[PDB]
């Protein structure tokens with residue numbers, strides 16, 4: 001057996017995706033950088049058997065297309081799967097789109113042509129994505145002209161998706177109705193693409209509602225419309241492609257390959273001809289609102305989740321250190337701190353950033369440096385615990401504030417109760433529950449909260 005950490009060292013965390021964390025890693029010999037998705041066997045159940053997973057992996061490694069993330073290697077130990085792929089640095093498509101001041105049907109067609117081209121290739125090799133959405137579209141690099149790379153093609157077949165809301169935010173909008181009912185094939189990827197296109201040209205989901213379940217009720221019915229004012233600025237051709245992608249009965253829905261030949265793709269991807277090409281201003285602003293809402297809901301859930309974890313780990317670490325403290329004096333040396341923190345990791349296993357003993361020792365050392373000023377030999381286990389854990393939550397509280405500021409586009413310092421309803425609907429926190437909480441934070445509020453109040457609401461909503 002090949003051992004992942006014998007070949008790769010973790011450099012830093014890139015982000016969190018479907019099925020687990022993605023870590024930027026480096027080959028210890030060749031210096032090659034790679035993005036490694038680390039799938040925790042305890043958090044993510046397998047749908048297929050080992051034999052079937054190894055065959056898919058072997059096939060995925062041999063496929064190459066400019067719009068599909070490249071998979072290089074695959075490893076498995078006792079606790080995890082490690083999927084080693086190429087690293088891309090351009091970020092999510094929609095986060096790039098919202099930074100633009102101009103965006104036209106030509107831009108949307110360039111985008112969707114890449115996606116269809118990647119999908120067409122994968123379907124020829126009988127691989128289905130199933131969970132296609134804007135988050136799965138990454139830009140190769142931060143350059144303006146960057147290609148799209150679809151991530152996670154094929155994983156849904158072998159791993160069961162999380163039922164935690166923090167993991168399924170913005171999933172409901174894109175799922176094909178046949179996937180909900182159980183009989184699906186590769187045409188589900190065209191539907192998801194169709195939803196994405198609708199969003200690109202209007203900035204609003206064709207199937208929408210106040211919570212995950214209302215969205216699904218709309219998807220399952222299959223009915224949508226083009227009556228938004230900003231569709232008047234959109235070519236008839238584009239709407240026609242959309243109708244064909246969003247056709248309810250999958251045998252009647254256009255194939256990926258045929259969608260590539262559609263008049264709209266043929267017309268608006270000719271690099272020269274701007275026969276009539278206005279900028280879709282309302283769309284871009286709707287997308288910016290959509291995206292800020294999604295990101296703030298997501299950051300709010302991860303904030304709560306991080307706060308629940310830190311309650312768990314603080315108490316567990318303290319009990320581990322307490323038992324290691326044979327003196328009873330409350331002190332421990334470095335190796336013991338390392339030993340208990342590893343004992344924590346052995347139990348916790350939510351920390352893919354700590355891929356080997358080398359990772360642990362350095363985290364401990366960051367904290368021993370952090371104990372303000374240093375006496376070597378006898379360390380107050382109590383303070384190390386506070387600092388180790390504050391460290392763990394940083395990314396998530398800091399991210400929460402950032403996302404609040406980004407959602408507050410007029411810099412008003414506040415979010416309205418109408419806005420709270422939209423955020424909490426997307427986060428799937430019941431309506432009665434969040435108002436009761438507000439009422440307790442600020443008994444006099446007048447339909448808006450500042451950042452501190454919102455944060456206090458989140459703490460109450462996770463039992464603090």
Ligand SMILES: CC(C)(C)n1nc(-c2ccc3ccccc3n2)c(C(N)=O)c1N
Pocket residue numbers: 014015016017022035036037069083084085086087088089091092138151152
């Ligand atoms: C941190 C975010 C933006 C969510 N991310 N995710 C990936 C990614 C996503 C899925 C992967 C599956 C197998 C191997 C590598 C994978 N890498 C990835 C990448 N490969 O560059 C990247 N930048």
